[PDB]
Amino acid sequence: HHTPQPCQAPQQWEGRQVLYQQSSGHNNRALVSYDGLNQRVRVLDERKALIPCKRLFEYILLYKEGVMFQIEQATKQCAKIPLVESWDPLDIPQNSTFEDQYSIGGPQEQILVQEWSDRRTARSYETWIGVYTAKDCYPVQETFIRNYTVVMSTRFFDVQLGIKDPSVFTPPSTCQAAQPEKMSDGCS
Amino acid sequence: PQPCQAPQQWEGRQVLYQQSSGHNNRALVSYDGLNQRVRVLDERKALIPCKRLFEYILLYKEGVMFQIEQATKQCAKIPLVESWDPLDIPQNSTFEDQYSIGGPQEQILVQEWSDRRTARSYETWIGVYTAKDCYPVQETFIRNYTVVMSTRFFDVQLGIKDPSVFTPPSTCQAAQPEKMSDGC
Ligand SMILES: *[C@@H]1O[C@H](CO)[C@@H](O)[C@H](O)[C@H]1NC(C)=O
Ligand SMILES: *[C@@H]1O[C@H](CO)[C@@H](O)[C@H](O)[C@H]1NC(C)=O
Ligand SMILES: *[C@H]1O[C@H](CO)[C@@H](O)[C@H](O)[C@H]1NC(C)=O
């Protein structure tokens, strides 16, 4: 009945994430470091299971200087990928549409979250949906829609405030050399 | 870390996502695992293209599902081939992970359980439930490493407020045996 205003989402944190992509129907787990103050992000592929072997990479997205580095985890072999997209923080735009509010879990173990979108009233057209906790405004889930169809969804877990170690945003020595082509998911 | 016991009767709300369509479908849901029956009521955040809204009453002990159009109460009777699978963690699940959603003043712990057999390369089901009380959060079905569908649960209230919700309306005598189409 009453419509909240967007809380401010914390702009430096580390935790874990599961990124789902429509086009493959796959989930990818990863450690994540998010520094919205310096507009940089680091993502380290994680495995729960060894079941199909995949190569594992670490990504360092430095938006100020328009590059993302992909880095093979064991070998430290690199790839300099032009990152040309504009910075877009993980937060709730002041003009977001309040969609809904609900609880996850159940009585005695629960948390209220709020769902926010960019859908204009009386339009049915969404490109972005973001779910954040109601008190601390921690990020819970983020979804990108194209033609009424989900393109990717990310869930966030184990969010801790601050950056334990800013050097994670420093690419290894091998990345000046860095090639230009993006390496492949599989050992196969 | 040990499989908890999901409650066998509750009501709340869900979002079902399907890979084939890339769509989300929102519903109110009453889950009655004692009587092996579910009631799903399509709900709407917005008016998009025009989709008809249905209510489904799934009665597994009887082998049938009733599809009921919400305004007109027009009704189909469709047999239920799928046998009953409760929304719980089998006592033989593989523990996958544990993590928190939220932060200091507002945090819950959830556990992720699965189907996977380590060293035999298969997994068809992943379930997320809260650690202490075993409330259901998310359920995902998998085929060859690829998500088929996933449902998220919210606003879970214990119990069934009114068991009549599983009693279909009179019209469901008129056993139109074809499922009603999604379009207007
Ligand atoms: C402002 O908010 C609206 C959501 O109603 C969104 O559509 C629009 O893109 C936002 N403006 C920008 C992107 O600066
Ligand atoms: C967008 O959605 C509509 C309706 O579902 C579909 O007919 C259309 O083909 C889609 N767009 C594209 C580019 O295919
Ligand atoms: C473990 O036990 C069940 C039977 O209760 C068996 O059918 C199941 O497939 C096993 N776990 C899985 C799903 O791999």
Numbering used by the authors:
A (entry chain D): 36 to 223
B (entry chain A): 39 to 222
Text from the published report:
Orthologous proteins to ependymin called ependymin-related proteins (EPDRs) have been found to exist in various tissues from sea urchins to humans, yet their functional role remains to be revealed. All of the EPDR1s fold into a dimer using a monomeric subunit that is mostly made up of two stacking antiparallel β-sheets with a curvature on one side, resulting in the formation of a deep hydrophobic pocket. All six of the cysteine residues in the monomeric subunit participate in the formation of three intramolecular disulfide bonds. The EPDR1 fold is very similar to the folds of bacterial VioE and LolA/LolB, which also use a similar hydrophobic pocket for their respective functions as a hydrophobic substrate-binding enzyme and a lipoprotein carrier, respectively.
A total of four monomeric subunits of EPDR1 were located in the asymmetric units of the human and mouse EPDR1 crystals. The refined structures showed average Cα r.m.s.d.s of 0.5 Å among the four human EPDR1 molecules and 1.0 Å among the four mouse EPDR1 molecules. BSAs of ∼2300 Å2 (per subunit) were calculated for these dimeric interfaces. Fish EPDR showed glycosylation at two asparagine sites, and the human, mouse and frog EPDR1s had two predicted N-glycosylation sites that were all conserved. Although glycosylation at these Asn residues in human and frog EPDR1 was only slightly perceivable and was too disordered to be modeled accurately as sugars, the glycosylation at the two Asn sites (Asn130 and Asn182) was well ordered in the case of mouse EPDR1 [Figs. 3(a) and 3(b)]. While the sugar modification at Asn130 could be modeled with only one N-acetylglucosamine (NAG), that at Asn182 was sufficiently ordered to be modeled with two NAGs (β-1,4 glycosidic bond) and one fucose attached to NAG (α-1,4 glycosidic bond). Such sugar modification is as expected for the initial glycosylation pattern in proteins expressed in insect cells. Interestingly, although Asp121, Pro122, Asp124 and Glu175 are conserved throughout the frog, mouse and human EPDR1s, a phenyl­alanine substitutes for Tyr177 of frog EPDR1 in both mouse and human EPDR1s. Since the hydroxyl group of Tyr177 stabilizes one of the water molecules that bind to the Ca2+ ion, it is expected that the mouse and human EPDR1s would be likely to have weaker binding to the metal.
